Amino acid sequence: GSSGSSGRQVQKELGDVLVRLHNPVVLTPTTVQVTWTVDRQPQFIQGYRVMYRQTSGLQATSSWQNLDAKVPTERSAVLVNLKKGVTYEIKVRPYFNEFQGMDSESKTVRTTEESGPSSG
């Protein structure tokens, strides 16, 4: 007697999903580009939760952040409003409603101090 439910293979595929985090391409000291890829793209998934936070700065281990991509087709997120001259730990992990599949190998990004020649 299944009254009603959603996402059957969610608790089966979710975890399975193996997100491969390449590296947080640091473009600017105030913004970092995050890229990743998945072998088995989940159909139930609603998007991706990119958690980031400081590790060296003062805000370090102070309060974790979350950037809801809100797009199951966006395998890359951009974290803005970042401090310059400080490492930042970020990890990509899938999520449907509340739960979130296994997190990828947290990669630390070092935001240079001197801004380089950027265009855009």
Side-chain angles (χ1 to χ4, degrees), residues 26-43:
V26 45
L27 308 166
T28 29
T30 51
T31 328
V32 171
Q33 205 201 327
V34 179
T35 313
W36 69 86
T37 192
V38 308
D39 197 52
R40 295 166 202 164
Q41 170 185 298
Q43 273 179 333

Side-chain angles (χ1 to χ4, degrees), residues 3-64:
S3 281
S5 292
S6 294
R8 290 188 186 181
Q9 195 165 321
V10 67
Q11 282 181 70
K12 183 90 90 71
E13 160 60 346
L14 169 88
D16 281 24
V17 177
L18 208 160
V19 191
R20 189 175 198 287
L21 207 57
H22 302 238
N23 69 78
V25 179
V26 45
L27 308 166
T28 29
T30 51
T31 328
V32 171
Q33 205 201 327
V34 179
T35 313
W36 69 86
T37 192
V38 308
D39 197 52
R40 295 166 202 164
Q41 170 185 298
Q43 273 179 333
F44 54 98
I45 205 172
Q46 278 306 281
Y48 284 96
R49 205 169 284 169
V50 179
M51 277 182 63
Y52 66 101
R53 75 157 186 196
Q54 210 153 238
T55 59
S56 180
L58 203 300
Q59 297 273 333
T61 178
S62 195
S63 308
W64 270 102

Side-chain angles (χ1 to χ4, degrees), residues 59-103:
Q59 297 273 333
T61 178
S62 195
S63 308
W64 270 102
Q65 290 160 108
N66 327 64
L67 185 81
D68 39 51
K70 298 285 197 178
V71 187
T73 62
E74 280 160 12
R75 301 279 183 70
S76 70
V78 181
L79 312 167
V80 296
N81 320 154
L82 303 173
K83 203 178 208 90
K84 62 166 72 156
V86 52
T87 325
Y88 274 100
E89 190 167 55
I90 317 155
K91 59 270 190 83
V92 171
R93 75 176 83 186
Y95 86 76
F96 182 48
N97 290 130
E98 151 68 43
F99 43 98
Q100 57 303 94
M102 290 150 52
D103 54 87

